[PDB]
């Protein structure tokens, strides 16, 4: 999923 | 002190170029980043992202398998464009992913990229 | 998963209060941002789930609106607000609308 949050 | 600064751009020929994203005032390796350009003239146009782990790589239906998105946590984000075509002339900006929710919240201040046939 | 904003354009004066609107195809929840950009410059996040202010934004910027339609409202418009603003929807990849242009009356 591209947009789940790719931050820590 | 959330800094970007772009550079890498110019001129080439329908050939290869590799865009920087020197990242200041905020932890590079705990965000991810993004790649958005903007036609002159016209609005903006998602290219890529990659998560601050390097483990995911999406990229737009129109760079895939031509444009690479990389980092080295330097301090910098990178896009080696190879196979460049015509349409892909815009200003290309670097962007950071903001806390709560994954969207762009800082931006670079873009560099164009100009591609003559 | 397309924006339509809308006007396209609107003058305005100093002081006035200004409103900008933008319809997703598809529902959105608030997964909405708002952004501003001025000629040959990097645009700057004003808000972001629909409703938040980015820190550093002036007071006077609002968002509202849930599920496709959507607004950003300009209160008491300060001449630095002459710009053109995107709304943008970050739920499937990244989509921005056409942009609203807000120029000088006279």
């Known amino acids: 999923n591209p947009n789940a949050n790719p931050n820590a | 002190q959330v800094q970007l600064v772009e550079s890498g751009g110019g001129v080439v020929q329908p050939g290869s170029l590799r865009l920087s994203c020197a990242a200041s005032?905020?932890?590079?390796?705990?965000?991810?980043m993004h790649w958005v350009r903007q036609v002159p003239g016209k609005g903006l146009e998602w290219v890529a992202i990659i998560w601050f782990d390097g483990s995911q790589k999406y990229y737009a239906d129109s760079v895939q398998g031509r444009f690479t998105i990389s980092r080295d946590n330097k301090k910098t984000l990178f896009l080696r464009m190879n196979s460049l075509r015509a349409e892909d002339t815009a200003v290309y900006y670097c962007?950071?992913?903001?806390?709560?929710?994954?969207?762009?919240?800082?931006w670079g201040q873009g560099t164009l990229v100009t591609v003559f046939n | 998963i397309q924006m339509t904003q809308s006007p396209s354009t609107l003058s305005a004066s100093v002081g006035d209060r200004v409103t900008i609107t933008c319809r997703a195809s598809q529902g959105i929840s608030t997964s909405l941002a708002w952004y501003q950009q001025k000629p040959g410059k990097a645009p700057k996040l004003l808000i972001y789930?629909?409703?938040s202010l980015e820190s550093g934004v002036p007071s006077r910027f609002s968002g509202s609106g849930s599920g496709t339609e959507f607004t950003l409202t300009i209160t008491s418009l300060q001449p630095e607000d002459f710009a053109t603003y995107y709304c943008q929807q970050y739920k499937r990849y990244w989509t921005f609308g056409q942009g609203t242009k807000v120029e000088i009356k006279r």
């Open positions: 005032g905020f932890t590079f390796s705990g965000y991810g």
């Open positions: 962007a950071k992913v903001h806390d709560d929710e994954p969207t762009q919240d800082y």
């Open positions: 789930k629909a409703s």
